[PDB]
Amino acid sequence: GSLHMIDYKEIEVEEVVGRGAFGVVCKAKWRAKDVAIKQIESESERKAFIVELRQLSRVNHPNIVKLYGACLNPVCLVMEYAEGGSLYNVLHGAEPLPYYTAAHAMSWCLQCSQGVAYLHSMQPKALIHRDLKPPNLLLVAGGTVLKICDFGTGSAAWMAPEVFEGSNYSEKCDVFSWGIILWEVITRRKPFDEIGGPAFRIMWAVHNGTRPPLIKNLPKPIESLMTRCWSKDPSQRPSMEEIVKIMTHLMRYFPGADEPLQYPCQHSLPPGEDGRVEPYVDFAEFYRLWSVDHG
Numbered sequence: 434g435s436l437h438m439i440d441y442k443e444i445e446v447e448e449v450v451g452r453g454a455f456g457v458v459c460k461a462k463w464r465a466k467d468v469a470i471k472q473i474e475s476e477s478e479r480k481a482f483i484v485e486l487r488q489l490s491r492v493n494h495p496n497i498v499k500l501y502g503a504c505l506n507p508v509c510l511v512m513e514y515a516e517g518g519s520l521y522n523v524l525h526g527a528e529p530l531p532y533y534t535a536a537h538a539m540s541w542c543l544q545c546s547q548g549v550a551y552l553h554s555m556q557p558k559a560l561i562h563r564d565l566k567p568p569n570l571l572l573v574a575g576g577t578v579l580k581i582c583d584f585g586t587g588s589a590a591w592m593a594p595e596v597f598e599g600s601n602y603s604e605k606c607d608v609f610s611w612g613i614i615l616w617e618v619i620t621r622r623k624p625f626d627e628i629g630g631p632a633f634r635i636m637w638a639v640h641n642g643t644r645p646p647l648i649k650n651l652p653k654p655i656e657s658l659m660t661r662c663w664s665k666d667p668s669q670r671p672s673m674e675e676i677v678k679i680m681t682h683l684m685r686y687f688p689g690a691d692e693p694l695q696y697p698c699q700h701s702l703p704p705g706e707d708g709r710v711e712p713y714v715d716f717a718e719f720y721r722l723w724s725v726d727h728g
């Protein structure tokens with residue numbers, strides 16, 4: 434629980450790259466280092482911004498964004514620069530989009546659950562992220578390593594129904610989100626894109642039972658996990674610790690996650706029947722590797 438202190442005058446700020454729950458994130462330089470910083474856009478944000486430092490001073494984990502230091506001259510946080518930027522951008526952003534594999538898809542989710550599991554295990558009190566979604570998931574090391582940010586804080590497509598119903602919630606809201614992200618990286622589709630209108634239309638939908646469509650040829654181990662994560666009832670969702678364990682196990686069947694994203698991709702988006710959709714990733718190699726171990 435300590436924060437390295439930075440003089441703001443020794444930072445050279447550059448173009449905007451993000452905006453989280455509050456503040457604004459920019460590309461910047463600091464001691465000849467490529468860097469991200471978030472600032473307060475308004476003096477009114479001073480208080481929330483201080484709480485986030487008190488949490489981030491305590492966290493420390495490979496799948497959470499490295500906070501280099503901070504400053505109070507004007508109040509600001511200095512982080513590592515995710516060259517890849519947002520997972521949202523990688524999946525859905527401007528062209529050219531990178532090619533990625535099932536192995537990448539699962540490795541990303543594994544890494545996210547590892548990050549959240551750490552948060553959930555925090556003492557004296559668990560940190561709940563509350564806003565898990567690809568815009569908050571940053572990539573480094575050539576698309577290989579995923580890192581969480583904007584935690585302890587257009588979100589409706591990843592929000593557990595008990596949250597937006599204003600009711601009591603817990604760690605399990607993050608598990609719902611994670612279930613949605615899993616679907617998203619396997620399909621490379623925006624959840625509830627075809628619903629649209631404002632967020633309340635998605636909230637009504639999800640509240641009333643609606644989930645993303647099922648995925649043609651999805652392995653059942655993964656399908657059962659994903660859909661347990663989506664349960665209306667939070668107590669029916671697995672814990673993140675369990676998701677980590679499961680996902681660690683499945684990675685046996687997904688080699689190649691260490692390969693950097695380097696191939697462009699011009700995939701079209703072929704709409705399924707309306708009931709089921711096709712995955713973007715290919716599970717053929719999973720089914721083959723699985724056969725060698727089992728039947």
Ligand SMILES: CC(=O)N1CCC(n2cc(-c3cnc(N)c4oc(-c5cccc6nnsc56)cc34)cn2)CC1
Binds near residue numbers: 514
């Ligand atoms: C491919 C492309 O168009 N690029 C390269 C990637 C660039 N990029 C870097 C970030 C980025 C880098 N380092 C960070 N630490 C970052 O954090 C965020 C970010 C985004 C949203 C909320 C949030 N909260 N805390 S950090 C945060 C973005 C970002 C976002 N885009 C944009 C231009």
